[PDB]
A paper describes a structure:
Starch Synthases (SSs) transfer glucose from ADP-Glc donor to elongate pre-existing glucose chains via α-1,4-linkages. SSs are retaining glycosyltransferases classified within the GT5 family in the Carbohydrate Active Enzyme (CAZy) database. Here we present three new crystal structures of SSs of different families and origins: the crystal structure of the catalytic domain of SSIV from Arabidopsis thaliana (AtSSIV), of GBSS from Cyanobacterium sp. CLg1 (CLg1GBSS) and of GBSSI from the glaucophyte Cyanophora paradoxa (CpGBSSI). In all cases, they are in the closed conformation forming ternary complexes with ADP in the donor site and the inhibitor acarbose occupying the donor glucose and glucose acceptor sites that approximates the active site at the time of the reaction.
Numbering used by the authors: 18 to 542
Write the structure that this text describes.
């Protein structure tokens, strides 16, 4: 068939990234482009990207009543014409290359521009197909028979800007809008007085207005404690307006799709739109070219599934040495990777450390970046457990590859996981996953590949008065869950899990065909 597709989000690897979001908006659009579709990605210009060149095409977008000049920077990479929205609110943010902290200064603290920024980002994204000729400035323009894939709350306003501004005036009529939920807790909930600044018609105010007792913290600077009233408050919600006007909802896992429809816990407070409209779970793939331990760049000894035992223990020595753990091939090696906050479950895992080293015997590597509390405790691991544990906060792409090939077991104690990528990455490289039993972790870590202890407790949640000194005995589920899995290290069962893990196929080729048909339905052909 072949059609025009336009991805719209707040991250694209390698340019911006705080986690999986960026990686999906790198991989998915390329693997769609391989099928013959004309694909584009649209992201903000947070920093002066050396490979991003000004198209010279400007436009003016109305925000907070004042017109705003924005520019459009372009780059063709892997058949995907990516575009970057240039403006002072994105580019001139707090310094040190941004990288992480795209959306806030600290972690838990957001920038008060975010309403206007992602209001600006969306409207601007709707211009790009109309007024920028690609690949070269003497080439064709994208046009109007274009499907928009929009990713999380940050691009949750393009369905409603599309209909309320553009389709009104007789363009993008053939165009449809797909929403893609990577996460449910992040909904773009803002105070109601930011309404004027959005520049949507007054009819469309009804779709943004929203009532709940849980609001994210006051958007000032220092506070990060979600206020909780008895009578529900009035506020905004970009994500609901994404659900209202999206011509289809997708999400990143069959199991997670189920958990969002399930009710106000699993849908945060938005369950009744998803359950009404429907949500197709398409689990995330991975890049096979990049993640391939038979042919990997960052590996000393490269190995297949036929030659695992040798290859891993070789790359484990490298790892043990690099972290500075005793170089013992018979000592188990558990690896944790994920952001340092409540969702990924560091706080409990770290409380569970003595039992993992002192009682089970294993070594524990710990990558992560996020809140100041858990970052502090991570660095001091190698002090308190000398040569039996390390905590790396701040790290490189290269450092995550050696960690997988070296680790015996990989650990994810998540409260919930829409899909997760570190367990997919591990299984590719033979590291046997010990996981929390939620979402994409349930779908991906089958019993043939790994272990699945029961999930970790949260509150009524989106980080309320977080982890009650009591509920933080979630720890014991990890102590227990690991004890089973590691008792069995060096079994023929373990060698079967190793082989099983790597024979699984995580390439997008399959996933894309599902994504591709969901388009055809929403359109017509
Ligand atoms: C990894 C994660 O990256 C992005 O998450 C952002 C939020 O989008 C952003 O709003 C911000 O969250 C803060 C929030 O705004 C505020 O209310 C609160 O006070 O503090 C929060 C934390 O500071 O920060 C995070 C991190 O920068 C994406 O938007 C998320 O969707 C994404 N997680 C997803 C993505 C994938 C990819 O498929 C899944 O595989 C993964 O399991 C899932 O968690
Ligand atoms: N603290 C971090 N900051 C930014 N990226 C990270 C961090 N920890 C891991 N990563 C990278 O992000 C991805 C992990 O994302 P995923 O497992 O989908 O869950 P989440 O997106 O919630 O972190 C991996 O590709 C890994 O390279």
């Amino acid at each position: 068939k072949k059609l025009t597709i336009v991805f719209v989000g707040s991250e694209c690897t390698p340019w911006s990234k705080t986690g999986g979001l960026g990686d999906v908006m790198r991989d998915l659009p390329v693997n769609l482009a391989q099928r013959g579709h004309r694909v584009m990605s649209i992201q903000p210009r947070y920093d002066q990207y050396f490979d991003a060149w000004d198209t010279a095409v400007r436009s003016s977008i109305k925000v907070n009543g004042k017109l705003e000049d924005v520019g459009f920077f372009h780059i063709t990479s892997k058949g995907v014409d990516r575009i970057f929205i240039d403006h002072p609110w994105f580019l001139a943010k707090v310094w040190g290359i941004t990288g992480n902290k795209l959306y806030g200064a600290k972690t838990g603290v957001d920038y008060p521009d975010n309403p206007m920024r992602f209001a600006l980002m969306c409207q601007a994204a709707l211009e790009a197909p109309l007024r920028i000729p690609l690949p070269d400035p003497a080439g064709t323009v994208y046009g109007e028979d274009v499907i928009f894939v929009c990713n999380d709350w940050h691009s949750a306003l393009v369905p409603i800007y599309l209909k309320a501004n553009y389709k009104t005036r007789g363009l993008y009529q053939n165009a449809k809008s797909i929403f893609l939920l990577h996460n449910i807790i992040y909904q773009g909930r803002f105070p109601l007085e930011f309404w004027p600044a959005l520049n949507l018609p007054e009819a469309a105010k009804k779709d943004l207005v929203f009532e709940s007792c849980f609001a994210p913290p006051p958007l000032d600077g220092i506070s990060e404690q979600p206020i909780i009233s008895l009578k529900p408050m009035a506020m905004m919600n970009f994500l609901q307006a994404g659900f209202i006007h999206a011509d289809r909802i997708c999400t990143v896992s069959p199991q997670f799709a189920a958990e969002v429809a399930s009710g106000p816990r699993g849908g945060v407070e938005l369950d009744k739109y998803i359950r009404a409209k429907g949500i197709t779970g398409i689990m995330n793939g991975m890049d096979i070219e990049m993640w391939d331990a038979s042919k990997d760049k960052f590996l000393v000894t490269k190995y297949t599934a036929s030659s695992v035992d040798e290859g891993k223990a070789a790359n484990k020595a490298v790892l043990q040495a690099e972290m500075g753990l005793k170089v013992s091939p018979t000592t188990p090696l558990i690896a944790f990777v994920g952001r340092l906050d409540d969702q990924k479950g560091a706080d409990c895992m770290v409380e569970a450390m003595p039992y993992l080293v002192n009682t089970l015997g294993a070594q524990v590597v710990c990558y992560g970046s996020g809140r100041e509390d858990m970052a502090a405790k991570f660095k001091a691991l190698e002090k308190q457990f000398p040569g039996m544990a390390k905590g790396k906060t701040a790290f490189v792409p290269k450092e995550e590859h050696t960690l997988m090939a070296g680790a015996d077991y990989v650990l994810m104690p998540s409260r919930f996981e829409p899909c997760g990528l570190v367990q997919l990455h591990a299984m590719k490289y033979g590291a046997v996953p010990i996981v929390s039993c939620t979402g994409g972790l349930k779908d991906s870590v089958i019993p043939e590949c790994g272990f699945t202890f029961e999930e970790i407790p949260s509150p009524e949640y989106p980080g309320m008065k977080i982890s009650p000194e009591l509920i933080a005995k979630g720890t014991k589920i990890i102590e227990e869950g690991c004890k089973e899995a590691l008792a069995g290290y060096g079994s023929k069962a373990f060698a079967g899990m190793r082989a099983a893990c790597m024979k699984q196929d995580f390439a997008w080729k399959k996933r894309v065909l599902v994504y591709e048909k969901v388009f055809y339905e929403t359109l017509g052909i």
